[PDB]
Coordinates of N, CA, C and O in Angstrom, one line a residue:
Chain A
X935 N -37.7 32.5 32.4 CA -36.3 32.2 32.6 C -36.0 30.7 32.6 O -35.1 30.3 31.8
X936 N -36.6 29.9 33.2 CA -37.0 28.4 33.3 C -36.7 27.8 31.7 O -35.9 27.0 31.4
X937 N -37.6 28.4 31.1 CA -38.3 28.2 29.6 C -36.6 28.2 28.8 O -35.9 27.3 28.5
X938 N -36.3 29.4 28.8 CA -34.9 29.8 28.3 C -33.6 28.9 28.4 O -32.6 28.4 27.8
X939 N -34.0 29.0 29.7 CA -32.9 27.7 30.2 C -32.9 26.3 29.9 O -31.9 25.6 29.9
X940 N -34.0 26.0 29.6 CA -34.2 24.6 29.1 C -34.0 25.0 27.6 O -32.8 25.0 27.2
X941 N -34.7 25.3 26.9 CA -34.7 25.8 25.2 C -33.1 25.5 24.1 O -32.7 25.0 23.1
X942 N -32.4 26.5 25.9 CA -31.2 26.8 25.2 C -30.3 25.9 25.3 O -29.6 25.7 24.4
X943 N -30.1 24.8 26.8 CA -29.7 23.0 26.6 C -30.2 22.0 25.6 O -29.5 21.2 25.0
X944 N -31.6 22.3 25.5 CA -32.1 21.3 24.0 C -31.6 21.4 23.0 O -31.4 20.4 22.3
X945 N -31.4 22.7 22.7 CA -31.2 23.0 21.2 C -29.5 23.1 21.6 O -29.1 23.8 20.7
X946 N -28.6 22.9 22.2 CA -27.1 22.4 22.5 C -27.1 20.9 21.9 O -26.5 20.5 20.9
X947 N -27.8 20.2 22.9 CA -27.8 18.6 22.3 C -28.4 18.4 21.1 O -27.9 17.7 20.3
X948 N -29.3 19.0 20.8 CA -30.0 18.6 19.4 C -28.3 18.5 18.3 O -27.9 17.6 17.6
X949 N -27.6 20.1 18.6 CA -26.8 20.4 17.3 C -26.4 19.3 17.4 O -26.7 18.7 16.3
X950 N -25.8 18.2 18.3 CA -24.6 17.3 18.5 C -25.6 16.0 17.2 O -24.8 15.0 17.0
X951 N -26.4 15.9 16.7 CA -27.1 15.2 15.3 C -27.2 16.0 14.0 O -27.8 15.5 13.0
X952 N -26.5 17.3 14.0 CA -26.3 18.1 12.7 C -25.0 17.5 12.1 O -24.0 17.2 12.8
X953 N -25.2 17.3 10.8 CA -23.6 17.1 10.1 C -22.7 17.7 9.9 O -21.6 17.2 10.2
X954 N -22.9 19.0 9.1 CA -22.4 20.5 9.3 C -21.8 20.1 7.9 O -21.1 21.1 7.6
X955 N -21.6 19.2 6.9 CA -21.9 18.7 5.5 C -20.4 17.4 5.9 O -19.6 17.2 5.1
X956 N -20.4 16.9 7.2 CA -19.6 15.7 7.2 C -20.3 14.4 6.7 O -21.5 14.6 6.7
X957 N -20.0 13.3 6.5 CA -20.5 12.3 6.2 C -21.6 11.5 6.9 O -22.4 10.7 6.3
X958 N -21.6 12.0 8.5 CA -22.3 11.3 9.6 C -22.4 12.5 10.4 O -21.9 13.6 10.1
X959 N -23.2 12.3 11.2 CA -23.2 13.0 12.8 C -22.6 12.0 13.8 O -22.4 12.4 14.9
X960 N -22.3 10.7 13.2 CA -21.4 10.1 14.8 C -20.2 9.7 14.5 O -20.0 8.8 13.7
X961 N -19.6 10.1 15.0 CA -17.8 9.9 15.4 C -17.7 8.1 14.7 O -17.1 7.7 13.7
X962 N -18.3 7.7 15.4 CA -18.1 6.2 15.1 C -18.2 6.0 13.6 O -17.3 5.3 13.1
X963 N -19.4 6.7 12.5 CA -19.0 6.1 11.0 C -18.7 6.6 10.6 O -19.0 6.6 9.4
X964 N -17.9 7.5 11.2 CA -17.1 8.2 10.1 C -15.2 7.7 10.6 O -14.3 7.8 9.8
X965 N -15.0 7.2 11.9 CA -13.3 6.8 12.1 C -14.3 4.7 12.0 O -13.6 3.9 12.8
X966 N -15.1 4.1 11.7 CA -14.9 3.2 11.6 C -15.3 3.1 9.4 O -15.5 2.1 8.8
X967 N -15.3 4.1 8.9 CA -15.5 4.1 7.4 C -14.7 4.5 6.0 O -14.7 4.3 4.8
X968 N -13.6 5.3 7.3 CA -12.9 6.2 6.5 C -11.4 5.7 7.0 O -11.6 5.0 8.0
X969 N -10.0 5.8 6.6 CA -9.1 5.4 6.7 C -8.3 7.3 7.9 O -8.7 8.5 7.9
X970 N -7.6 6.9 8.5 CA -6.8 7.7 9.4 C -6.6 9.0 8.5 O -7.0 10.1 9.0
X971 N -6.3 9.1 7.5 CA -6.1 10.7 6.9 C -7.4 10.8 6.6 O -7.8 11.7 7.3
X972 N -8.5 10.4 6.0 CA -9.8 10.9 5.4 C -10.7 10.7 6.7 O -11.9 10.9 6.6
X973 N -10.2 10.3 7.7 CA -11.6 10.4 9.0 C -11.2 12.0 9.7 O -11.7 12.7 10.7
X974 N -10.5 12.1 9.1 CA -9.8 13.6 10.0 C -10.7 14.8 9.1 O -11.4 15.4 9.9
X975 N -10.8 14.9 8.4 CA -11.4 15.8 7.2 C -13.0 16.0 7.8 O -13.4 17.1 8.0
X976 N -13.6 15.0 7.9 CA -14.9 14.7 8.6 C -15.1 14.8 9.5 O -16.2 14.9 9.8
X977 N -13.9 14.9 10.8 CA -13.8 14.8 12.2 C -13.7 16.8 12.3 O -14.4 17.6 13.0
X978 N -12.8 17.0 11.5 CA -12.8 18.5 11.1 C -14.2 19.4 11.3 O -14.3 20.3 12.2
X979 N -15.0 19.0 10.3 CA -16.2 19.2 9.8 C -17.3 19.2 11.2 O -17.8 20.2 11.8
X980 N -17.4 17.8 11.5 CA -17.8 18.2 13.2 C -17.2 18.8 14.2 O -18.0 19.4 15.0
X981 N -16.3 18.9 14.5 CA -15.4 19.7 16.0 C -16.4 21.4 15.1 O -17.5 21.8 15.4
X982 N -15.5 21.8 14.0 CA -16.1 22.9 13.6 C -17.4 23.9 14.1 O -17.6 25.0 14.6
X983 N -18.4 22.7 13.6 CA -19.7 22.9 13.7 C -20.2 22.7 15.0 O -21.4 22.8 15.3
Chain B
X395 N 3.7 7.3 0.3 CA 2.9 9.1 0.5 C 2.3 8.7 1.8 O 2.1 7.6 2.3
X396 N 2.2 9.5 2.3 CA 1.6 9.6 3.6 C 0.0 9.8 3.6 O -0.6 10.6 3.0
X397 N -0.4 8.8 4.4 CA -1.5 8.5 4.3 C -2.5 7.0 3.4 O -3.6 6.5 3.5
X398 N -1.4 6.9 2.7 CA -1.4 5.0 1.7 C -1.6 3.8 3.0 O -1.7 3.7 4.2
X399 N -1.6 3.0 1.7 CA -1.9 1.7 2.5 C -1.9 0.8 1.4 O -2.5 1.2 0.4
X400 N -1.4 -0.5 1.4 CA -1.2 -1.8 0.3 C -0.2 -2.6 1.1 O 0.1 -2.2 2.2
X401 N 0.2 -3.7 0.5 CA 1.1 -4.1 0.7 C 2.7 -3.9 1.4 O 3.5 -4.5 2.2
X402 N 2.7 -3.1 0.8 CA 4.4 -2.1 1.2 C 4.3 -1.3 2.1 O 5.1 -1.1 2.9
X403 N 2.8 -0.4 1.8 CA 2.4 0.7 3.1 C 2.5 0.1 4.5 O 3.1 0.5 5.5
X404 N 1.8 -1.0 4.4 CA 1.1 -1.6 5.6 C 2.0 -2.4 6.5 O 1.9 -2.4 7.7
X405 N 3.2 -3.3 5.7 CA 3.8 -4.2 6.3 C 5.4 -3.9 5.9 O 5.9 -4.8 6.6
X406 N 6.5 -3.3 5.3 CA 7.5 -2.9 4.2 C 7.7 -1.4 5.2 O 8.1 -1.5 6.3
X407 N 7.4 0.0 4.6 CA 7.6 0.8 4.8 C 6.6 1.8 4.9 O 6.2 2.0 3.7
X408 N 6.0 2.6 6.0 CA 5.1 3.4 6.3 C 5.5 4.9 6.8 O 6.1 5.1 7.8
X409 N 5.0 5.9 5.8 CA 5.5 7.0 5.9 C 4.3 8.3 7.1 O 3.3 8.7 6.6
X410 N 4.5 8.7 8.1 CA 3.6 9.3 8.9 C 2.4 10.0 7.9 O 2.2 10.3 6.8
X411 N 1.7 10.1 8.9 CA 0.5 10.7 8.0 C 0.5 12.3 7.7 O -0.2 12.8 6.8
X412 N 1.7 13.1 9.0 CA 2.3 14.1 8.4 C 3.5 14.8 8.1 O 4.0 15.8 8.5
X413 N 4.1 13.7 6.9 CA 5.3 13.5 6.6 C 5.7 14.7 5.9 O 4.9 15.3 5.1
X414 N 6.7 15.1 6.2 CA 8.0 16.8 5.8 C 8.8 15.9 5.1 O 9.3 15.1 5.8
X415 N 9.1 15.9 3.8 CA 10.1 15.2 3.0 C 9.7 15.4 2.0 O 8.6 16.0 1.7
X416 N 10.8 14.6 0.9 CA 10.6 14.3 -0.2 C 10.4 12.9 -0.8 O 10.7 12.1 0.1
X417 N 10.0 12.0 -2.1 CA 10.1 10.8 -2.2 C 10.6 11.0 -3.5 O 9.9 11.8 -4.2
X418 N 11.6 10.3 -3.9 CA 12.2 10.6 -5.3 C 12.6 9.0 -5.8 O 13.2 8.2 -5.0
X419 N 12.2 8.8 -7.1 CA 12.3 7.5 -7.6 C 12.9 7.2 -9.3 O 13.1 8.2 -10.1
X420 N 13.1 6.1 -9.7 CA 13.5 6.4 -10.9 C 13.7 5.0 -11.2 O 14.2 4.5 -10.2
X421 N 13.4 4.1 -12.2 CA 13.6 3.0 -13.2 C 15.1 2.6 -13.2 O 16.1 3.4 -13.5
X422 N 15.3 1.0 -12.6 CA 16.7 0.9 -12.3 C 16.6 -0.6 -13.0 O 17.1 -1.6 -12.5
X423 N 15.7 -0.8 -14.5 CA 15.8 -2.2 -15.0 C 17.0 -2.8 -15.6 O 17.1 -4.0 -16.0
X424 N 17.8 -1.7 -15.5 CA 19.1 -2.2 -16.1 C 20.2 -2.7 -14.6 O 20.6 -3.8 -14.3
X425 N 20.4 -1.3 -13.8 CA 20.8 -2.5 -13.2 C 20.3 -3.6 -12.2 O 21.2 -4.4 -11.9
X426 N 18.8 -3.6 -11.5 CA 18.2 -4.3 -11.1 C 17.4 -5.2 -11.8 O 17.2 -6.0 -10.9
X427 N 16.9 -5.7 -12.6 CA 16.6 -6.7 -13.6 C 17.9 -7.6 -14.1 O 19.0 -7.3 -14.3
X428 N 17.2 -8.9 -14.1 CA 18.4 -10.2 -14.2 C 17.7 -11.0 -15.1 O 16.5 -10.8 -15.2
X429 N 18.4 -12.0 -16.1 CA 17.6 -12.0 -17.4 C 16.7 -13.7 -17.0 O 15.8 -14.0 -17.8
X430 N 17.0 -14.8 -15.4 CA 15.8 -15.1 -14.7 C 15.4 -14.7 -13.9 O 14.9 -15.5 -13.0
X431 N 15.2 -13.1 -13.5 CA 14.5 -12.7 -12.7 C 15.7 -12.3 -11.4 O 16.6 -13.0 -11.2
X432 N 15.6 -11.1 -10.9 CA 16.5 -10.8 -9.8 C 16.1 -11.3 -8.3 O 16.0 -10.3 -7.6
X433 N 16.0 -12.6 -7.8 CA 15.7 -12.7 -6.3 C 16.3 -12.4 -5.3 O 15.9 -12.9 -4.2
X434 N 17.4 -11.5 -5.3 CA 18.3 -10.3 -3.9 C 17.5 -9.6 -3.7 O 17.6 -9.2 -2.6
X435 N 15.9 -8.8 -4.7 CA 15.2 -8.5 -3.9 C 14.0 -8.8 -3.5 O 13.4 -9.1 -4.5
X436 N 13.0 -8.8 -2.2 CA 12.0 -9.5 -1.8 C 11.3 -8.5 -0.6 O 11.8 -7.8 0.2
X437 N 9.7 -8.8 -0.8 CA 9.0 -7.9 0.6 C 8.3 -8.7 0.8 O 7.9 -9.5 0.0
X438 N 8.0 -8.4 2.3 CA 7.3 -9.0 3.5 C 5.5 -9.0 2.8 O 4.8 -8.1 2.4
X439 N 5.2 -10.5 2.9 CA 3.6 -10.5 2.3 C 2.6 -10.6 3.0 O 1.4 -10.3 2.8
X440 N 3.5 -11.0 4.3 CA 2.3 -11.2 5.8 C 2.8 -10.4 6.8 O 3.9 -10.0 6.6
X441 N 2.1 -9.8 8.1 CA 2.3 -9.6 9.3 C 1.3 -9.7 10.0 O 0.2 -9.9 9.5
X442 N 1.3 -9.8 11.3 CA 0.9 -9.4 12.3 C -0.5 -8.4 12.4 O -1.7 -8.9 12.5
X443 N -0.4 -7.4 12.5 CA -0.7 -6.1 12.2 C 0.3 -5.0 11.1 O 0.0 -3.9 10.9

């Protein structure tokens, strides 16, 4: 139970470094790379995933 | 269009990024063209932000 419980928080945070096919995994290079309509697309892409 | 940026976007006229309308345009060299140049009209080159 212990085991499970940790397993299943690690692998929560890990997802938050998947791209899910956006440009970045971090919020930051994708709204400091991209202009206001094309950081939404990418921001899309993560919320999603 | 919504979502631009230049000159005119940035400092002139900026249309939301989710703009409901239309933009309709058309060639007015006859009567806006002057045969040294028309200076009644003019846009902003600098701002602020």
């Amino acid at each position: 139970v212990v085991n499970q419980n940790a397993q299943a928080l690690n692998t929560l945070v890990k997802q938050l470094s998947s791209n899910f096919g956006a440009i970045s995994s971090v919020l930051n290079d994708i709204l400091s790379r991209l202009d206001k309509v094309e950081a939404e697309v990418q921001i899309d892409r993560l919320i999603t995933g | 269009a919504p979502g631009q940026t230049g000159k005119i976007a940035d400092y002139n006229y900026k249309l939301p990024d989710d703009f409901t309308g239309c933009v309709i345009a058309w060639n007015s060299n006859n009567l806006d063209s002057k045969v040294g140049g028309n200076y009644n009209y003019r846009y902003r080159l600098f701002r602020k932000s």
